[PDB]
């Protein structure tokens, strides 16, 4: 559950990602695939090589969904409804994989926006991605 400060932390931190959202999505992705090779079994139809166009495109999708989660942080379950059907019903992703991807997203952000990645902002972002993960892995339809 996000506090008032969490919410403001996340929105200002995200706004600083700016036009790099898609780029940060793809880097978090690459980091996860290299750091955690088991997560690759979820993308058997993806070209997963370095510089892959498929990974770059997917990163942008993930970034755009996170952006929309930021826009809709007070009613995320409704805003993310279609994404939870995909991830919870059809794919049935193991929640541990969302912790891996969230960690890689936090590594990307700390690498690219060091002055934004204060301890407090670190915590707020960690809770936000945990909240997104719960919604996407929960069957609530």
């Amino acid at each position: 559950v996000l506090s008032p400060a969490d919410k403001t932390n996340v929105k200002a931190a995200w706004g600083k990602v700016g036009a790099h959202a898609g780029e940060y999505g793809a880097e978090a992705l690459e980091r996860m695939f290299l750091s955690f090779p088991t997560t690759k079994t979820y993308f058997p139809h993806f070209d997963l090589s370095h510089g892959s166009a498929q990974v770059k495109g997917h990163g942008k999708k993930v970034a755009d969904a996170l952006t929309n989660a930021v826009a809709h942080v007070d009613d995320m379950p409704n805003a993310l409804s279609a994404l939870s059907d995909l991830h919870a019903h059809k794919l049935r992703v193991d929640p541990v994989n969302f912790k891996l991807l969230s960690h890689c997203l936090l590594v990307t952000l700390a690498a690219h926006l060091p002055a934004e990645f204060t301890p407090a902002v670190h915590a707020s972002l960690d809770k936000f991605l945990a909240s997104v993960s719960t919604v996407l892995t929960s069957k609530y339809r």
Binding site: R31, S35, A111, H122, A123
Partner: protein
Amino acid sequence: VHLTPVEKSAVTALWGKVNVDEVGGEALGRLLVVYPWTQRFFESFGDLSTPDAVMGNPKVKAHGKKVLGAFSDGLAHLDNLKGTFATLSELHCDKLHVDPENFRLLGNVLVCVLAHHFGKEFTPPVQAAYQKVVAGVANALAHKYH
């Protein structure tokens, strides 16, 4: 997944640039901030009630140093990590009863703190090597639970 010669070179390379009297303190301090129930293990350490309070607490920085030092040891003794942390496993598991998931979290916070500092130098491939290392320290650390 064990270490191949390329990443061995890669991680030890950037571990040398690490400042050994801060990052440890930021890793523990961020663990206490991001995962606050861990504070419970430190009521002896005094003021932890806000981030800035945590991140400057001399206890925390002090404690951090020896945790980073513990990590340095594991680096020097990858081929046999559980022996290295045999005693540490006993204190954390048998004495304090720290849930081992908390070990995994601290390793990932350290990895975050390396990214914060080294920026672009902390490439995906160098993270990949380090993730092998921290998972070794967390596993070695909970060996007595096994």
